[PDB]
Amino acid sequence: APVLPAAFGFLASARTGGPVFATRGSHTDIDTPQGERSLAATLVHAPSVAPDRAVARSLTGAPTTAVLAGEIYNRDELLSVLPAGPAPEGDAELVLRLLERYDLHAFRLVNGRFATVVRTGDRVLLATDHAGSVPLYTCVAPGEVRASTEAKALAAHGFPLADARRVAGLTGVYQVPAGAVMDIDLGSGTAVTHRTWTPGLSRRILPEGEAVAAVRAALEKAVAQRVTPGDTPLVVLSGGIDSSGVAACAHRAAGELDTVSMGTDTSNEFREARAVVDHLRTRHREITIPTTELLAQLPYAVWASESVDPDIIEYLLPLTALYRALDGPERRILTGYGADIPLGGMHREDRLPALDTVLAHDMATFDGLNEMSPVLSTLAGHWTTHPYWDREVLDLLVSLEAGLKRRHGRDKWVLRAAMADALPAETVNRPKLGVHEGSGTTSSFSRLLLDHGVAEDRVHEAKRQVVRELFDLTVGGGRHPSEVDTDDVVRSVADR
Numbered sequence: 001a002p003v004l005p006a007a008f009g010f011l012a013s014a015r016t017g018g019p020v021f022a023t024r025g026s027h028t029d030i031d032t033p034q035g036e037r038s039l040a041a042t043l044v045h046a047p048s049v050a051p052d053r054a055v056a057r058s059l060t061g062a063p064t065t066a067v068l069a070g071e072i073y074n075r076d077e078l079l080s081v082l083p084a085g086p087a088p089e090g091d092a093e094l095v096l097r098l099l100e101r102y103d104l105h106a107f108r109l110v111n112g113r114f115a116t117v118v119r120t121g122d123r124v125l126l127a128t129d130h131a132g133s134v135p136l137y138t139c140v141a142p143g144e145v146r147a148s149t150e151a152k153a154l155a156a157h158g159f160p161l162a163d164a165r166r167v168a169g170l171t172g173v174y175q176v177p178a179g180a181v182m183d184i185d186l187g188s189g190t191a192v193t194h195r196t197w198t199p200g201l202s203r204r205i206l207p208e209g210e211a212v213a214a215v216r217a218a219l220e221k222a223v224a225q226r227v228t229p230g231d232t233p234l235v236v237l238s239g240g241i242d243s244s245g246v247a248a249c250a251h252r253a254a255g256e257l258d259t260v261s262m263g264t265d266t267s268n269e270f271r272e273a274r275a276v277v278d279h280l281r282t283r284h285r286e287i288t289i290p291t292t293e294l295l296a297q298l299p300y301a302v303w304a305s306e307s308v309d310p311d312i313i314e315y316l317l318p319l320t321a322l323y324r325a326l327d328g329p330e331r332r333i334l335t336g337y338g339a340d341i342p343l344g345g346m347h348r349e350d351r352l353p354a355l356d357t358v359l360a361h362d363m364a365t366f367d368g369l370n371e372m373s374p375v376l377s378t379l380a381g382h383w384t385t386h387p388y389w390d391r392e393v394l395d396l397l398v399s400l401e402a403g404l405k406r407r408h409g410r411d412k413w414v415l416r417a418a419m420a421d422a423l424p425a426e427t428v429n430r431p432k433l434g435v436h437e438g439s440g441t442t443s444s445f446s447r448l449l450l451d452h453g454v455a456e457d458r459v460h461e462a463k464r465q466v467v468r469e470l471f472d473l474t475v476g477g478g479r480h481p482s483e484v485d486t487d488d489v490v491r492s493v494a495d496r
């Protein structure tokens with residue numbers, strides 16, 4: 001529903017001397033008071049949004065300009081540490097007020113879904129939220145610093161930056177790691193990176209009672225922060241405990257709930273989803289996308305996510321299509337995505353030792369996948385947020401000892417028990433089922449391959465070659481997905 005962030009993404013630059021995005025929306029070039037020596041930036045955002053709130057300026061320290069894509073959820077908290085009074089008019093101004101107090105350490109305090117770039121004097125700051133849910137890339141050269149929330153905008157011509165990965169194929173284009181802040185001196189072109197968050201490695205113990213309660217309270221608040229007062233949110237659900245947990249909380253926070261479920265002509269989860277829409281009495285809508293169409297949208301998913309990971313792509317393909325086929329006006333969409341990462345729910349492990357090993361490195365290897373990028377939905381005009389990856393909910397879920405994740409013969413137990421009084425028993429105890437499984441994405445994507453020659457002891461690697469190809473063409477090539485024929489790229493790869 002209405003009330004989206006002041007901005008979805010952006011392209012900025014800071015020099016001593018027309019961007020094309022996947023994100024759909026309006027563009028607004030911000031003013032440049034000191035012109036040449038100011039921070040130039042093109043903002044991409046909803047046509048019904050006033051970019052203002054995403055831009056803030058000041059003279060504190062120096063001439064300072066701040067651009068912020070996304071939103072912050074722990075506003076009251078952040079506002080409580082400041083000299084109360086001149087409340088900022090937005091998140092960008094909020095960030096600026098915080099930077100004046102804690103400097104770059106301010107980002108250690110922010111709980112949100114954002115990406116920002118700030119310039120003060122010849123100093124340039126680049127930051128992401130604890131999870132890096134709003135991809136942020138950069139080209140740093142002595143005297144020139146280009147920032148963008150999409151690598152495709154920076155894929156034309158920087159110098160190597162340490163503590164930052166290079167974007168596949170591109171050269172001189174880096175990504176700002178998750179939960180980090182790059183301190184950049186425009187003069188020398190030097191960049192220092194500070195991490196402002198890192199998964200916890202220790203585990204805490206708690207009796208079922210307290211554990212189930214803390215997990216519920218946290219989730220409820222994570223959702224409360226994400227739902228806008230007034231309009232009814234939209235929840236994309238499966239009729240999994242994850243998205244059902246979220247639907248339950250959102251329903252309470254908004255008093256009403258619109259839901260939507262995706263399916264293909266091979267399989268779907270409409271029955272599991274219906275069992276939830278009926279319990280909660282939500283306004284439901286089932287969308288079925290032909291497997292052929294599903295696969296035909298491969299280049300769009302890779303173009304929006306800017307990822308080259310085959311498996312993640314299979315997870316996003318169904319979701320991406322669903323966002324694109326969504327009917328009606330731009331919505332504020334909540335999800336239950338990510339819940340499995342801190343729970344190892346995608347591994348189906350009954351052995352605590354293996355469960356901890358698995359859930360752990362999973363937390364240490366999510367950066368760079370962009371699975372939770374907002375572009376997956378903003379390419380269609382929809383804003384998405386994921387409450388399970390809220391910093392507070394993530395911290396807690398991650399910290400729980402394996403015996404609370406795998407317990408009583410069930411996985412993700414703690415969460416299942418946390419929602420047992422708001423969802424039907426069949427739902428709470430429904431076995432884990434990937435979006436890419438309950439729709440036949442992974443299976444279908446293996447025919448189109450096998451149906452082109454590639455045999456067994458290859459298939460996975462082949463998908464990896466197709467996905468990498470789509471990337472080079474769209475992200476690193478300037479080619480719109482609609483110009484890349486999936487079946488063509490598949491053919492050129494069905495070889496070796």
Ligand SMILES: N=C(N)NCCC[C@H](NCC(=O)OP(=O)(O)OC[C@H]1O[C@@H](n2cnc3c(N)ncnc32)[C@H](O)[C@@H]1O)C(=O)O
Nearest residue numbers: 236237238243261262336337338339340341362433434435
């Ligand atoms: N980096 C890692 N190591 N982890 C990767 C694994 C990530 C994992 N995502 C894959 C996964 O199995 O999805 P899964 O937990 O099934 O699916 C993800 C989320 O997508 C939405 N969703 C799923 N199926 C549908 C459907 N049919 N219609 C509408 N919305 C739907 C739901 O809101 C749900 O909470 C997850 O944790 O969400």
Ligand SMILES: [Mg+2]
Nearest residue numbers: 242336339340
């Ligand atoms: Mg899940």
Ligand SMILES: [Mg+2]
Nearest residue numbers: 238240433434
């Ligand atoms: Mg599922």
